[PDB]
Scaffold this active site. Structure first.
Site, short mmCIF file in Angstrom:
data_model
loop_
_atom_site.label_atom_id
_atom_site.label_comp_id
_atom_site.label_asym_id
_atom_site.label_seq_id
_atom_site.Cartn_x
_atom_site.Cartn_y
_atom_site.Cartn_z
N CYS A 1 -3.34 3.84 -5.03
CA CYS A 1 -3.78 3.72 -3.65
C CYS A 1 -5.09 4.46 -3.47
O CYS A 1 -5.19 5.65 -3.80
CB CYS A 1 -2.72 4.32 -2.74
SG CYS A 1 -2.78 3.76 -1.04
N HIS B 1 1.74 -4.98 -0.42
CA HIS B 1 1.17 -3.64 -0.37
C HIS B 1 0.23 -3.52 0.85
O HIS B 1 0.26 -2.53 1.57
CB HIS B 1 0.41 -3.38 -1.67
CG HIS B 1 -0.36 -2.10 -1.68
ND1 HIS B 1 -0.05 -1.06 -2.54
CD2 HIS B 1 -1.44 -1.70 -0.98
CE1 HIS B 1 -0.90 -0.07 -2.34
NE2 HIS B 1 -1.76 -0.44 -1.41
N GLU B 2 -0.60 -4.54 1.07
CA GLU B 2 -1.55 -4.49 2.20
C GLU B 2 -0.84 -4.61 3.55
O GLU B 2 -1.16 -3.88 4.49
CB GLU B 2 -2.65 -5.54 2.09
CG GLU B 2 -3.42 -5.55 0.77
CD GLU B 2 -3.88 -4.19 0.30
OE1 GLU B 2 -4.13 -3.31 1.15
OE2 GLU B 2 -3.98 -4.01 -0.94
N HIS C 1 0.45 -1.37 4.69
CA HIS C 1 -0.53 -0.47 5.34
C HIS C 1 -0.63 -0.69 6.83
O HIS C 1 -0.78 0.27 7.58
CB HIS C 1 -1.93 -0.62 4.75
CG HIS C 1 -2.14 0.14 3.48
ND1 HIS C 1 -1.93 1.50 3.38
CD2 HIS C 1 -2.64 -0.26 2.29
CE1 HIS C 1 -2.25 1.90 2.16
NE2 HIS C 1 -2.69 0.85 1.48
#
Ligand code: NI
Ligand code: NI
Ligand code: NI
Ligand code: NI
Ligand code: NI
Ligand code: NI
Ligand code: NI
Ligand code: NI
EC number: 3.5.1.88
Length: 203
Positions: A130, A173-174, A177
């Site tokens: 990250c 993963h995005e 966020h």
């Protein structure tokens, strides 16, 4: 504000624009964007994609001091909006021939979400890194193997897309966020490398 700095014509996003672990913005639920997009939101998406391209070019990466990335989310730039960019290159063959398609996934996505997914889980064998985390973090980040996503592009056009393998991992993963979720939230607390039977380990 942060967005004003980022959208300046001459401004290139670099590591100094990326906020780090502990900054409260990384833990918020990012706000949906409205269409039609503001100029700032359109430009930000463009700058985010540009960052990923630059990060993948060995010389530009060296010039700007960048760690390679295949995705970036607006909260990592201190912008609490549901905007992500993804850029996953295909690889050359053993003969050094470029792939048919330069990228397997290349998109700036607005208001992305997972609408359905496989029962099967998957995790990258190598774990995940990250850009906002300056620590070694070992372990399998357990995600859905396959996802169906919806998102909007900069024009406001809606897209529906099924993803598997590495691209599925990257988009999840995005999206995490923009929900205030960090990769290590999904690593087993007691044994980072625990394998639940049927976990698809992607090499
Ligand atoms: Ni900057
Ligand atoms: Ni534009
Ligand atoms: Ni450039
Ligand atoms: Ni739907
Ligand atoms: Ni579900
Ligand atoms: Ni990330
Ligand atoms: Ni999920
Ligand atoms: Ni933990």
């Amino acid at each position: 504000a942060a967005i004003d700095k980022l959208v300046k014509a001459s401004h290139l996003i670099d590591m100094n624009d990326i906020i780090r672990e502990g900054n409260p913005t990384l833990r918020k639920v990012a706000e949906e964007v409205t269409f039609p997009l503001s100029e700032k939101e359109e430009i930000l998406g463009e700058k985010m994609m540009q960052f990923l391209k630059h990060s993948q070019d060995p010389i530009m990466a060296e010039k700007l001091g960048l760690r390679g990335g295949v995705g970036l989310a607006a909260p990592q730039l201190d912008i609490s909006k549901r905007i992500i960019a993804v850029l996953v290159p295909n690889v050359e063959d053993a003969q050094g021939n470029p792939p048919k398609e330069a990228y397997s996934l290349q998109e700036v996505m607005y208001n992305p979400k997972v609408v359905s997914h496989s029962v099967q889980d998957a995790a990258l064998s190598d774990g995940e890194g990250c850009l906002s985390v300056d620590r070694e973090v070992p372990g399998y980040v357990v995600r859905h193997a396959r996802v169906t996503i919806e998102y909007f592009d900069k024009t406001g056009e809606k897209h529906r897309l099924k993803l598997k393998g590495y691209n599925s991992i990257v988009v999840q993963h995005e999206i995490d966020h923009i929900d205030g979720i960090m990769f290590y939230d999904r690593i087993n607390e007691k044994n980072p490398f625990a394998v639940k039977e049927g976990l698809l380990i992607l090499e």
